[PDB]
């Protein structure tokens, strides 16, 4: 089973696949802890109710998007290490439609190289 | 076997992996029907013969790209639900080189979460 | 085991998963040879010490990125054929921080279609 997690803004809550062992753990405030070194794909959709969103790793800004219409794919593909904290933040949540705003992550491959 | 489908503009035709059960079904007019809830990656290449292309889900515009050179990767990563209809349309097909224009989709993960 | 390869700029060296048979082979000058037809995802990070980077397939420019801050995800998703040579080049390596600059590739699916 793949390792996938999805955070819904309407519920403010994480759901994840039942894959064992977990590759991620849900945290409060919409954060996620990476448990395994790996290559991960982050996806997501942000619908407006222009707004701006920021994807972050620990302190680092992975990306900043600004749009006056729905962003149907935020994120990208990143190597993360065990302990990395991933977060998606909004300039103002009053500008987004929570019912149709969510983000998520899937493990593509562990990093057992040469 | 992964679930993958690819549409070629030269043949106007879909080809797909032999994976059972199917996760997608080919439709006329270059459309595709999603059969399973899931996280999908859409890819593709559009070569010019500036042109514009639009990726759509049902009524929704997923993305619009405009370029005067080859776009080597259209698309992105999206959650789709069973019944969603995906389409890639061109502002004018006379502006593209069909022999080197194609698009496609692969299932990354079904959505069996928490 | 997935087929994954990663090139580090600090070592100027490729590392790869032990997956058999290989889907790629490392080459000198930071190049990579595709051994199997397939859909591949290219990722990478380029940190500055504005700089520009170019991802190439054989002669073809897949993409050109320019930034004055870290690019946390270069690349995208592409069909490659056996024999394709992939390369990532810099306008000037004196503008990048090699310790935190790397790029890589993972095989998503072989191309056994209809």
- Bin the strand percentage of chain A: over 45%
Percent of residues in helices of chain A: under 10%
**Global structural class of chain A:** mainly beta
Count of helix runs of chain A: 0
The protein's oligomeric status is homotrimer
Largest interface: A-B, 20 and 16 residues
Instruction: Give the CATH topology of chain A.
Output: Jelly Rolls
PDB class: immune system
Keywords: glucocorticoid-induced TNF receptor ligand, immune system, tnfrsf18, Structural genomics, PSI-biology, New York Structural Genomics Research Consortium (NYSGRC), Atoms-to-Animals: The Immune Function Network, IFN
Assembly: trimeric
Entry title: Crystal structure of GITRL from Bushbaby
Topology:
3 copies of one chain form a homotrimer.
Chain A lengths: L3 E5 L4 E4 L7 E3 L4 E4 L3 E8 L5 E7 L2 E8 L8 E5 L4 E6 L11 E9 L4
Antiparallel strand pairs in A: 1-2, 1-10, 3-4, 4-9, 5-8, 5-10, 6-7, 6-9
Quick description:
The first copy, chain A, is mostly beta strands and about 110 residues long.
Q: What does this 3D model show about the protein?
A:
The structure is a homotrimer of 114-residue chains. With 114 residues, chain A is mostly beta strands. The first copy, chain A, has one domain: Jelly Rolls (Sandwich), CATH 2.60.120. Chain A is 0% helix and 52% strand. The first copy, chain A, is built from no helices and ten strands. A five-stranded antiparallel beta sheet of chain A has the order 2-1-10-5-8, with no helix packed on it. In chain A, strand 3 and strand 4 form a beta hairpin. The radius of gyration of chain A is 14 Å and the shape is globular. Chains in contact: A-B, A-C, B-C. The interface between A and B is medium-sized, with 20 and 16 residues. The PDB classes it as immune system.
């Amino acid at each position: 089973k793949p390792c996938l997690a999805k955070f819904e803004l309407l519920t403010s809550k994480w759901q994840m696949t039942s894959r064992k062992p977990p590759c991620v753990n849900s945290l409060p405030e919409g954060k996620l802890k990476i448990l395994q070194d790996g290559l991960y794909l982050i996806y997501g959709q942000v619908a407006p109710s222009p707004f701006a969103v920021q994807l972050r790793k620990n302190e680092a800004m992975l990306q900043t998007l600004t749009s006056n219409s729905t962003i149907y794919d935020v994120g990208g593909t990143y190597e993360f290490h065990a302990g990395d904290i991933i977060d998606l933040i909004f300039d103002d949540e009053h500008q987004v439609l929570k019912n149709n705003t969510y983000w998520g992550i899937v493990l593509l491959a562990n990093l057992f190289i040469s």
